[PDB]
Symmetry: C5
Subunit: 270 residues, 5 copies
């Protein structure tokens, strides 16, 4: 029904390190050598809810990585503590393109449709894998066209709400569908996550990019994510809209995300 | 309640509430949605079908029973200090392959869940106090006798008539469309709500585990839990699912709560 | 104006006033159908034949509240007045807009939802120590209000009233009588009132509304002085249009919601 | 460059100026029909035949206000100037946009509301101690303004004026005469003026407007110095376009609203 | 660069003022359509995506010479100009209050001409060296050979539809680097501050502000601003305010100029 012991900071030289990385988008065609890279395959639409079987590659998934940190280690131990992150979406300016082979405005005389519609942006930084809760708009969705997707082995009506028997951890890049996995708010004590969704059909994307913003990862007690086994975990998804082909066929478009994470040495009980 | 000193003594309570859009049985199809919306032919024959009406989610939590010294003139109560609350499953709206109407002459995406959004939560030391107010005084709720609605109707209930009140004491039973928070009461509850209307309006939603909502009032006093009960209420409508033929259903999402409480001494 | 002196201290120096105002959208009789809405909107054939029907015009809501009497003697060197310090105010019944089964026009070839109340939003409130002072300004100087002689409008019309003509003023002294479309707060007066307003227009625009019991609006001015209640009267005014209800055949009515107020006042000494 | 010294204190060291400016949308004669609107908008057949009709072009509103005389000996090493410290400004008549019964196009097969005034919004104001300095910049260098010889525009046309050509400048010295479409604030000058503006475009966009008497805008710069009023003149300028009125047959006109100002000034000593 | 103390006293501060005109595609100030692109064209297929010359917006940029600081470049410390703050505005916003140009129009040829509307893209950067760029495109197959004055990579690969760090550049030429395929490199630009926004969609209302009252601080979290290498200050921007829709539905980008007023101070550094 209703429901690590942190000591002092280590000071002096080499008590701080920074980790820098980017994650490329996982919209469905996730192979950097292939023509549709950075987009999904063409979206298809189920005839009925009990025949909802998306094609292989039409499904966005989370991006994720584990980064090795310098090895630190007794009655106490030292852990890396994530203090802050500077993060930005890369390639926003690529959306200033209206000459691609797309549907166009004004009786074939106007601009090509820009990438537009649904936006979904999330990132997470933690000291262990992001903990996931299963929740879907259709419990009957059949993911069997792509056995590389990680989804529950059984299906039940209750998964259109919150059924806590259906959980996971984000342990693989380009494998956990966004549409059915979300952060588990009853866990993730050692991760910070931030997300937004703007829906609708052809909604204008609203995006910003700057190298001047720092996000503090410390909690209300002044403690950041503590990196278990000297691993830092970073996850994200950045859907910026749909590309609309000549005939009306549509694909998700995603952009990469950059991270610069500041960490510090923290002594902990052992 | 005359509030005295803090006891120096803390606890947290964690829970979620599932949405009550109308199909509220977790074992059946369409859980977390309403039944198909229907439309009255006239205002004097406005009788929603059973299960097409969203209602408030709510629960009462039994807190740890505090020692009380009835021989003395003070008592200890739990005081709700703050809450971290989030809508769960927002990413589930990133789905345009469901059996829905679709864009661009049957070649484009399925329509995502879109349209009206309604988001509210409340945390208090007693049931959320409600005021009746409706868009149509004549609405007939008799297709579902489990709904809690007034026993009589009157034209004046399209505005504020203070003779029509209730308390949110049952989950999945009080229609959002005719009950709102009573701003003349709720001295011992904090509530927060928003509505964004229109037909096919983009949902705009956020989720994070980093935001704390302070529940202390202007005197530094949080909700005080009468009889060791903590009351949590919400509703989170994120839009409508548009079926192939244009039939529509409300879609709602669950809400998570993590409430911090402390012991407070009060006059008995 | 009033010469403001020190605050009065002690255990009787504060009071609070709580009230609500029901909306005045046009059908303002609580015993009748369509309460809280206007009558059906009609459209002029030409600007010189612009005569709204009775009850299709929203008006301001207003009340004067009697405060506890101060000053048993009025011949004194100084007097005491109630000073409004702050207000907690909310729009009531926002959740009532979560209703798409009313007898309305509907989406997707008669299969989808009923249209929710949507379109133009207009929200304002005022708290003062005397009636809200008003300036006339209209979109059409020729508008003929004679279908309803209970509306308070100027007795003469002139072209210049489509801009600001300071010869056309009034005070908000009657509930449900001053049309919103032709009367606005007079920004050259209202020294003893605080007012706040917003407008979001367009045809079928989503209403965007909030409600909470946690927000206090401070009424003190830049000198730390709130509205001072002349004759021990507190004046509260508002209007809250949340959109239009679209009937089956396309006919439309304004929809308004009530507003709640909880006002904190304190005793202030003034020169007499 | 004026060298600022100390503030002058004591009685009579502060003054206030209150005024309003009526809108200059194109029909700018308060005695005539359509005051506060433009004439109907016309559309060029080609960029080399872009000759707007007289009265279809919004212009800036502006006034020079004579301040109280600062009488003093002019031969000494200091002088006194009025310094504008802050302004409270509001758009007047926002509630007038709550009107959907005017002779307009209407919604839902001639059954619904008249279209409210909607679309493009442009709001700007400026307070300074000399005229607002202007930069010419246009969307079409060939625009022919000769239908109305009272408009102030450059005497020559050149392709480069579709960007910033610093040889094309002016000063806002006349009300209802400088078109908004081709004159903007010069950001390389205006050291002695503060200006603030916003534009929201699109075709039928909802106007989003606020009004309150509770907001003060500080005019002091980063060094604590406000506009200094040369020759005891205070310059106020604005434009407030709130959208278009859509007539029965689809003909459209700009609609503007007046703006109110309350400006606080103080005496400042300057080097002579 | 090892940053030491501020230089104080008379002449320790200077200001730079400039504007940059927009580079939408027709970038010749003596010709018609200046400040706009040429007419937008649409590829028939992905492998025939070859924009016409002049239809492609590029970044504006300039390097400004600052007062010379070091007569002897072999001293054990040197002085550099440090950019502290910038006041920047988009110029000519009021020019968008124009609905009588030769455009498509509303309401069955009776209403207003369409105003410039749709996609907005706004960015500026101030730094002590050229803005560092990362290549990223919506279509690796885009053929820029209709205009060999555009600076783009000679070899393009599918991986350029995401972030491939092998594809970088520096913004060293005005009116030459297309916005559609070059963005700031977030893994570099340690000595530049950049700010950008994009609002997309088809006919979206432009939402724009202008004022002379806002100062943007360029100091980083350590209190250090961009340090001007070789006494050069680098300013870059792009301000797309939408499209002009011609009578027949043909569309062109419209851009506006941007003004900058930059305050700089003398900073000692190790040499
Ligand atoms: C709100 C309302 O009154 N709905 C009524 C509906 C609608 O008028 C039509 O279905 C059109 O949607 O008709 C019913 O026969 C039905 O379908 O069950 C009765 C129901 O009470
Ligand atoms: C604003 C206005 O002038 N309304 C007038 C209307 C409208 O012109 C039409 O009904 C079209 O809606 O016509 C009336 O005969 C009516 O219906 O009562 C008189 C009324 O004065």
């Amino acid at each position: 029904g209703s429901h690590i012991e942190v000591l002092n900071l280590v000071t002096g030289p080499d008590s701080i390190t920074t980790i820098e990385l980017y994650l490329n988008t996982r919209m469905g065609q996730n192979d950097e050598s292939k023509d549709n890279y950075g987009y999904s395959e063409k979206v298809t639409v189920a005839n009925s809810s009990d025949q909802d079987k998306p094609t292989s590659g039409e499904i966005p998934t989370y991006s994720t990585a584990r980064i090795n940190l310098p090895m630190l280690n007794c009655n106490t131990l030292t852990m890396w503590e994530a203090v802050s992150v500077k993060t930005e979406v890369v390639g926003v300016s690529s959306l200033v393109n209206v000459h691609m082979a797309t549907k166009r405005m004004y009786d074939d005389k106007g601009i090509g449709f820009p990438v537009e519609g649904m936006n979904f942006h999330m990132f997470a930084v933690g000291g262990e894998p992001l903990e996931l809760q299963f929740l879907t708009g259709n419990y009957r969705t059949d993911y069997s066209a792509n056995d590389k997707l990680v989804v529950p082995p059984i299906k039940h009506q209750s998964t259109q709400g919150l059924n806590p028997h259906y959980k996971q951890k984000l342990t693989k890049d380009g494998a956990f569908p966004v549409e059915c996995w979300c952060p588990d708010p009853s866990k993730n004590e050692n991760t910070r996550y931030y997300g937004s969704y703007t829906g609708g059909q052809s909604t204008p994307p609203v995006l910003q990019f700057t190298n001047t913003v720092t996000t503090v990862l410390l909690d209300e007690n002044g403690v950041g994510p503590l990196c278990k086994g000297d691993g830092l975990y970073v996850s994200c998804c950045d859907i910026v809209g749909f590309l609309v082909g000549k005939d009306g066929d549509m694909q998700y478009r995603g952009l990469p995300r950059y991270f610069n994470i500041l960490l510090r040495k923290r002594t902990v009980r052992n």
